[PDB]
Amino acid sequence: DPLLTRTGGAYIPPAKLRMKNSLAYQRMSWEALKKSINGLINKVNISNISIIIQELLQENIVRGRGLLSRSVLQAQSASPIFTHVYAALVAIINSKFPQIGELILKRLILNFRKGYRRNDKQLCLTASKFVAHLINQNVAHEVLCLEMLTLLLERPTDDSVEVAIGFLKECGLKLTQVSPRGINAIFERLRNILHESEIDKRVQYMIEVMFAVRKDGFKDHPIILEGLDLVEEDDQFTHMLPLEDDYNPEDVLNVFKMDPNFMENEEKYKAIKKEIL
């Protein structure tokens, strides 16, 4: 905020604005790509995800993999109400470009850790919610959920328990299926907190809620909503990314830079596009 440089002036409508070359063209194409992605990410919802994917795939999302990752991550952070939809979108892209799903996951994990470190509850709540749904979508391995829950529950605070319980609600049904002993360990831990600890009303209530959810079999928290399970089981690529690893977010990929092999790299992508359509 006080660090980032300040660029003022009036917004100018595109219709109004329109009323060497290699660099100029790469920059222009870069700017159009960023805008196109931004629009698609704003548009995506359950009823239109397939068309959004098709329109997204027309763009060079390899060259713009950082741009796409950033747009999806910013969108989910501002609009966690659509987390399930962003997860499904990521799941489809990852099935075709696993390296892009991996880049999103790496940054999301780092985002969660930043939030935890800074005691930024909201960011912990939204980043964890995203993790849960990427797990639901088999984009990320459940070891990440288990490790985050253990971290949150080690020195339980009102905020740390809140994050953990909201998180377990979202990925719990999936957890139960792929790692019943793991989720059992989490519940035992919650049980020890509920009795073998000196807790306040807020913590006690959130835990009783979590046990209540498990008893009804997560009836209000299905793994994937009808309309979003769009990747065939065997076509998905499940990344095994632990919580603690020293991931490189590669945010430098978000910044425009002249590409000497721009020609080759461009023709390379269209060869990919024609493949998966």
Partner: protein, 389 residues
């Protein structure tokens, strides 16, 4: 009067729980709730119950019959550990008769919970009050004076108290019970949650909440007021009608938007813009005057649920859409009074917002008219608007 029509607002954003089954209530309580005859929770209930049971200090205010008694009765029961045979909640009321009425209510709702509740009678029954308190009652109710006597006598142990409810607090103050109420609160454990229920908000009540509460949630009857204060208003000089859609599209390529509401002046424009955005792969709900109020409300439900991320409307409603990031006046209203009704903040706690006005040269004067009329300011939209949300 139909007290179901009474509207409330909250001092911070809260989860609005539409049903008793979405509140996170223990099952044996829910059994008692439905068995009593409850079906749908009232507006105050859909807001206050969740906040009390999650542990927040709460001030709840409205005239009689909006569901305030059920609100604290249910919340008190939810927080009981039946296995602990010690008083865990205290309910102060302006009369003994109301205390008894409260007790009976608690017993009914808590019938599947094995709850123990006692209303302190006094009179020739003080000995009997003492007996019961010594035995151990999960909930005790009565006047501040009577409750304070039992505490002072040591008949009412306070060590397990987690909750204090002040029922009809303004009336207790009117009866002269202020001292007794402060006296009771002074003898309770440090972390005690406090819930205050009152039809009115005089100074003594607000000072009382300041002294008894920590970061309280205020749930009050909504103020019938609108203002442009707190709304960031911008205009974009689009110059020509034919340039509006391209500009809207560019905003969506540059801004971060959760949901947005788009106003137009005419059903015709709404139908047109809906077709255009849908063809552009937006998810859109559209609303206009040709449809009955029931349809409009249903469509608003669909939009609020997130089924669509764009709501396009004529002037048919202020709005309550917590997930709405931005309001766009695709058309500037010909009438100046409709402007605030589109983008205004309602209530003392109305959400801050952002409005973006598309202005043709044709509308240069109507824009200026609006600015003058509300005595407000509407800046030219800056390129870094995305940073200001």
């Amino acid at each position: 009067e139909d007290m179901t029509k009474v509207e409330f607002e909250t001092s911070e954003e809260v989860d609005v729980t539409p049903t008793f089954d979405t509140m996170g209530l223990r099952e044996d309580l829910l059994r008692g709730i439905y068995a009593y005859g409850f079906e749908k929770p009232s507006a105050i209930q859909q807001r206050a119950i969740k906040q009390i049971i999650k542990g927040r200090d709460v001030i709840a205010q409205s005239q009689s019959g909006t569901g305030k008694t059920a609100t604290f009765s249910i919340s008190v029961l939810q927080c009981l550990d039946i296995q602990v045979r010690e008083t865990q909640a205290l309910i102060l009321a302006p009369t003994r008769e109301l205390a008894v009425q409260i007790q009976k209510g608690l017993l009914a709702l808590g019938d599947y919970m094995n709850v123990q509740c006692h209303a302190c009678i006094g009179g020739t029954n003080v000995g009997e009050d003492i007996r019961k308190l010594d035995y151990g009652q999960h909930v005790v109710a009565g006047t501040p004076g009577r409750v304070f006597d039992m505490i002072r006598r040591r008949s009412l142990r306070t060590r397990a108290i987690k909750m204090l409810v002040l029922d009809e607090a303004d009336e207790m103050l009117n009866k002269g019970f202020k001292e007794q109420i402060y006296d009771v609160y002074r003898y309770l454990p440090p972390a005690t949650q406090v819930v205050l229920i009152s039809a009115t908000l005089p100074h003594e009540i607000l000072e009382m909440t300041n002294k008894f509460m920590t970061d309280p949630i205020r749930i009050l009857v909504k103020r019938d007021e609108l203002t442009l204060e707190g709304i960031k208003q911008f205009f974009v000089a689009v110059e020509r009608e034919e340039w509006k859609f391209d500009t809207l599209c560019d905003l969506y390529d540059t801004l971060t938007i959760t949901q947005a509401v788009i106003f137009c002046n005419t059903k015709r424009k709404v139908d047109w813009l809906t077709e255009k955005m849908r063809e552009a792969n937006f998810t859109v709900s559209s609303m206009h005057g040709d449809m009955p109020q029931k349809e409009r409300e249903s469509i608003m439900k669909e939009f609020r649920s997130g089924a669509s991320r764009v709501l396009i409307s004529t002037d048919v409603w202020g709005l309550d859409v917590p997930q709405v990031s931005l309001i766009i006046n695709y058309d500037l209203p010909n009438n100046r009074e409709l402007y605030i009704h589109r983008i205004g903040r309602s209530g003392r706690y109305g959400r801050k917002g952002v409005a973006i006005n598309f202005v043709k040269n044709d509308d240069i004067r109507i824009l200026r008219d609006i600015e003058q009329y509300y005595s407000t300011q509407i800046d030219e939209m800056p390129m870094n608007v995305a940073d200001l949300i």
